[PDB]
Amino acid sequence: FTGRKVVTEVDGSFVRAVELQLQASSITIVGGAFALATTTGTKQLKVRDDNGTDV
Amino acid sequence: GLISDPVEVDPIQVGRDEAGWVQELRDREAWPKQEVPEQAKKPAKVGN
């Protein structure tokens, strides 16, 4: 059995924690131009930003 | 056949190619780089 809680303030705000994220300036499609083996073939795309994050 | 006859196709080779686990690789000297072969990205079998 489990339980979890996020401790917020009296007014309701959450100040005990901070979230940081990396800015993204551009994105590219991994692998560049690709050719399917067959017409009916499918390929799952992957997009990565300038930081290498899979977006 | 005969002993002097040319070497015939090995059934082991046929089964080996049917299983499709012989490693295919990108041509090292090709430019631009080739796309990855179909077998090089085949998933692991769910069982055996």
Side-chain angles (χ1 to χ4, degrees):
Chain A
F1 298 160
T2 61
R4 59 191 186 189
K5 190 77 209 315
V6 169
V7 170
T8 59
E9 293 320 294
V10 175
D11 63 358
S13 67
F14 186 43
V15 302
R16 295 179 186 270
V18 160
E19 175 194 32
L20 302 94
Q21 195 163 14
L22 276 163
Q23 295 178 14
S25 43
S26 80
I27 64 152
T28 63
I29 292 169
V30 174
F34 64 101
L36 289 161
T38 46
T39 71
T40 52
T42 78
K43 178 173 179 291
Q44 166 67 283
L45 266 189
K46 154 169 273 176
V47 193
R48 274 199 207 271
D49 56 343
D50 63 358
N51 297 295
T53 310
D54 186 39
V55 294
Chain B
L2 309 172
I3 295 290
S4 81
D5 270 354
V7 161
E8 53 189 357
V9 171
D10 199 356
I12 301 299
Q13 189 265 329
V14 174
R16 172 185 80 191
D17 289 17
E18 212 289 314
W21 287 120
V22 171
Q23 203 54 48
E24 292 83 4
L25 304 168
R26 284 177 308 110
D27 186 19
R28 171 162 63 151
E29 291 307 322
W31 196 254
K33 67 176 182 179
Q34 313 181 331
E35 76 289 335
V36 172
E38 182 66 27
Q39 189 273 330
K41 65 179 73 175
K42 65 182 280 176
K45 183 175 174 66
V46 188
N48 63 358

